[PDB]
Design a protein around this ligand. Structure first.
Ligand code: HEM
Length: 104
């Protein structure tokens, strides 16, 4: 009648957590929110690879897998929003420090 709205722009860890279905594959990369549902098809690992990560900040993982500057840039095509102040500094800014010392 007289209104409009779209583009998540800013979502909460929960909002993204709710979206973890092949239909609502939402995840957070680096600190933004991307629509995996739009990047489902694509990806070598498959659609799940994204779904299995959809439902929160996948960066924490996507960082280990060590994606390519292309994969990251490509995600910019799915970017629908970003993590709000509800869990920004909670995920925002990637980082990981683990000691690797195995043998098997
Ligand atoms: C929003 C984030 C993601 C995007 C846009 C993305 C994109 C891609 C792309 C383009 C590739 C092909 C090679 C490359 O990395 O450039 C790839 C491969 C892969 N990704 Fe992701 N990925 C994302 C998140 C993840 C997460 C969270 C995991 C782990 C849970 C994951 C696991 C893998 C694996 C195992 C491969 C296959 C390895 C290979 O191609 O040799 N990805 N991803």
């Amino acid at each position: 009648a007289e209104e409009s709205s779209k583009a998540v722009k800013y979502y909460t860890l929960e909002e993204i957590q709710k979206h973890n279905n092949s239909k609502s594959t939402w995840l957070i990369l680096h600190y933004k929110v991307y629509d995996l549902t739009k990047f489902l098809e694509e990806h070598p690992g498959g659609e799940e690879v994204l779904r299995e990560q959809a439902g929160g900040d996948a960066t924490e993982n996507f960082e280990d897998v060590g994606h390519s500057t292309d994969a990251r840039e490509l995600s910019k095509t799915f970017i629908i929003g970003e993590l709000h102040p509800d869990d920004r500094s909670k995920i925002t800014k990637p980082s990981e420090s683990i000691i690797t010392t195995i043998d098997s």
